[PDB]
Design a protein around this ligand. Structure first.
Ligand SMILES: [Zn+2]
Ligand SMILES: [Zn+2]
Lengths: 362, 362
């Protein structure tokens, strides 16, 4: 019935925009064919729609955001239930739309999203590989469109007047390239050089102008925090990573999120993490900072506010460094080798942080 | 200063043939820039040369084979030592040249080969992905040419008359695509569907017209066969796999090769494995067949000769099936689920094989 429910796109526009030659400078257009289904797969689609947009700035007007708005207005017209949404989108999401879809997925337990992309947008760019990793960890299922999916979206969203789908040359080769690229950038771990040069806890002299953040999640069963291998991650910063962890898909009740950040939070990061832990009673937050970040301003009140709201704040020592080497770094079997005076420096940093967080005088 | 030793190629030819846009139908030339060094990086090159060929049949005339012949004649003119060979080749090797380079590397303890490829030849084709895996397990180091390598072989092998190397557009994007592809096809494991449809041991009715073969190697230390995770593998067949395992690239003395083949060897495979196990006393061979292959001919005497020459020949039961599910299959965490009557069928097949191999009557 999808044909009834959509107003189809021209065969030429489909062939033009879903051609999956990986590099395609000239396509300023995104097309997003979406279908909405119930929990069980035998059921027919409740609705479907085609969205269009441009790749260039003002992302509010990107088809992903248009879908989010349309879907928000659509769910209010139907009894509340669990939905499975499938996308056939000609370009992979941008950084901002990845963030927005990830927030939406992490805060909604009743929505499942599968995204089939024809081409990866900016697969060479570390920000976008991170964007796809964020989307995947929020719970979206990222895939490359293969022959079957082009056939399906020809049949369902294109005015293929009885016409069968006829592939262009090199469709499977482009799929091979794109699916290898997506698989690797999804399974990517931190580089050893950037780990040891960003988590090094000696006084700043060089570099380190970015924040690096590893995180693990555990949940509570029988008063013992059992780990959840499936939702570890690491992020690079120049809002709030806790808005991207789906605290609902992890087996229920309560959670503890352990955080290893190369720099201690600046003021607004502390404010946002405090607001989150205050609006989400079921989550405990543990922070481990390699270094204290002095933003010349309100960082101290930020850390104190974060501490008063239940977060535990400490500095990384040997075991946290080794843990993040083993877990989040592409170590290649090589073991963690600490820099000189790591323990010394971390004890001094612990002293400054304790002075910072100290409330009552002795 | 390789330039002394080579006659450089034209800049036009270099830009034309080493352009690394992944798909390039129109280049049927291969160019192979080779440099030979001793075993340390500080040393200068002893020699270097450029080879050319065509991609299309008669592979004896492919630049890989030309290098093998030239190198064979070259080593006989120099005091024997350990060599490190580096290749800058515009296309990755074909199946046959992958086989021959792999055999050469596996038989030779004094040669180290690193192959930097600009483009992957037939990356979409399972035979060629297998070819690259064969090359890698023989000990060759496969890599994609990046900006640095194009710069290096511009400087060393091209008549860039003082001119520096100026990249074409999309060089790094193509590198990202190609190295994601190479990494994926290198780390590839067997598909679950093809595993259980090829190693299923109930009587043939459908398919199974190809042979699938997993293998692991152990070596002997302290009268206990210690495993060697790094030299496992699996191959698909329509010379002899033991000719591709480098029995010399690990703790010496002696080895045991355990082989799990979906079909028992046909006659000529048995004769070739017998010749290998006879010409290499330091290697023990264990065969596990899922099914007996009756080629209408001399398969029985083949198995019997293989047994006389020291190989141990058995049929797979639950433990071998489960082992290869765990080790060589992309199981995805999913556990091995045996088919009905697996054990029965394996006992009957073991009985037939025992009748086959039986020498003396009782
Ligand atoms: Zn966007
Ligand atoms: Zn060849």
């Amino acid at each position: 019935q999808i044909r009834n429910m959509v107003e189809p796109m021209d065969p030429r526009t489909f062939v033009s925009n879903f051609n999956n030659r990986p590099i395609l400078s000239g396509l300023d257009t995104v097309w997003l064919c979406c279908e909405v289904k119930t929990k069980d797969p035998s059921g027919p689609p409740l609705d479907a729609k085609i969205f269009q947009g441009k790749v260039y700035p003002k992302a509010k007007y990107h088809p992903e955001m248009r879908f989010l708005r349309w879907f928000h207005k659509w769910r209010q017209l139907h009894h509340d239930q669990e939905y499975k949404v499938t996308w056939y989108v000609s370009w992979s999401p941008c950084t901002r739309c990845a963030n927005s879809v990830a927030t939406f997925l992490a805060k909604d337990p009743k929505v499942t999203l599968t995204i089939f992309v024809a081409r990866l947008y900016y697969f060479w760019d570390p920000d976008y590989q991170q964007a796809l990793r964020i989307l995947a960890e929020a719970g979206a299922t990222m895939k490359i469109m293969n022959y079957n999916e082009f056939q399906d979206c020809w049949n369902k969203f294109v005015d293929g007047r009885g016409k069968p789908f006829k592939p262009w040359n090199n469709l499977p080769k482009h799929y091979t390239l794109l699916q290898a690229t997506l698989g690797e950038l999804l399974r990517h771990l931190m580089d050893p050089g950037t780990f040891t040069s960003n988590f090094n806890n000696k006084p700043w002299v060089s570099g380190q102008h970015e924040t690096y953040l590893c995180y693990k999640v555990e949940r509570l069963h029988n008063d013992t925090w059992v780990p959840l291998n499936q939702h570890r991650g690491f992020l690079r910063n120049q809002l709030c990573f806790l808005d991207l962890i789906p605290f609902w898909k992890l087996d229920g009740q309560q959670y503890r999120v352990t955080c290893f950040t190369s720099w201690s939070p600046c003021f607004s990061c502390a404010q946002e993490m405090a607001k989150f832990i205050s609006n989400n009673e079921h989550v405990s937050l543990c922070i481990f900072a390699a270094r204290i970040y002095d933003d010349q301003g309100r960082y101290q009140e930020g850390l104190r506010t974060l501490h008063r709201d239940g977060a535990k704040i400490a500095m990384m020592n040997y075991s946290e460094f080794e843990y993040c080497w083993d877990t989040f770094v592409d170590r290649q079997g090589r073991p963690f080798q600490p820099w000189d005076g790591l323990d010394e420096h971390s004890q001094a940093l612990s002293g400054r942080l304790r002075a910072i967080l100290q409330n009552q005088g002795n």
